[PDB]
Write a protein that binds this ligand. Sequence first.
Ligand SMILES: Brc1c(Br)c(Br)c2[nH]nnc2c1Br
Ligand SMILES: [Cl-]
Length: 333
Amino acid sequence: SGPVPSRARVYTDVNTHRPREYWDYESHVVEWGNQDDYQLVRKLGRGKYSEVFEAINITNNEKVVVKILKPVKKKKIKREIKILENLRGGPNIITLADIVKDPVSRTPALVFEHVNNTDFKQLYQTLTDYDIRFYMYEILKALDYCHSMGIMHRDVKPHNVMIDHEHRKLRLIDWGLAEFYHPGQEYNVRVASRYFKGPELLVDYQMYDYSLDMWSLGCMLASMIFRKEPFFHGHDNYDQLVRIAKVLGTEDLYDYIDKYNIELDPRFNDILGRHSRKRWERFVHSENQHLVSPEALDFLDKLLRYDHQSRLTAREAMEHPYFYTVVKDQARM
Ligand SMILES: Brc1c(Br)c(Br)c2[nH]nnc2c1Br
Ligand SMILES: [Cl-]
């Protein structure tokens, strides 16, 4: 019959206990500022929905980042804004400084407190064992926070992590795909980038939660420790699941299909095949063995699960042995 419902293991009802205004972003009223308070200096990047610039706030000569939004439905703009306002001041979350419109074109833009244009993809293939653990732990602070605040990011990838490596400092950015978690809500599966899409998205299971972000985290982690970019390298969304299947095995995949009574797209009938669950040692070689430990593999194994309910929560992840020396060094400092 229909697909079996799912609920988050943690932070399940947090939005329900909030005032409506917290999560009812469609009702949020934006007070739009004047973009002529800022002067654009140089282009930092391009996105699907946005042109990103370094700018100066004339009023105080502070450097900022201006994300000029390419046109899109007002609904999506309010969602990003409301989420950013709700998470402001949270650990390792990018800080929204201002919301503005160009007076002539009327194009909306978000102004963020300045952080370096060096995304994580630019150096996550060259880090030491300790630094991978350090920066992973820092990303986990952001995810545990946003999840505790009733929000899933849905676009966790190296490009959305800004690192100031000189200052051992990190910001989770681009909340334009993030959404509020509500028990029983069915969500859009066209989210995240191919290589970081969780199996729920790939088999069209809509009642997903915070655990989505933990799959993506696992994908990042595997890429870093095995020096393999990306770890799951699909040609498209169908072949993406096949890539996962060749590592995680088809047995746990079908058990997962059956548990949630998922109707599998028939394009998958021919291509998934039958594969054993592979031991992680298979991806260890001379150029990456220094980043790989029993702790790292145990942790990774507990992130990369078909069944979203089986994956570690961000808090559970932060308590894994992999981070013991990070936690000890943090208390010291
Ligand atoms: Br580059 C960059 C920076 Br810096 C920030 Br902050 C962004 N926020 N959304 N998209 C962003 C991009 Br692309
Ligand atoms: Cl990326």
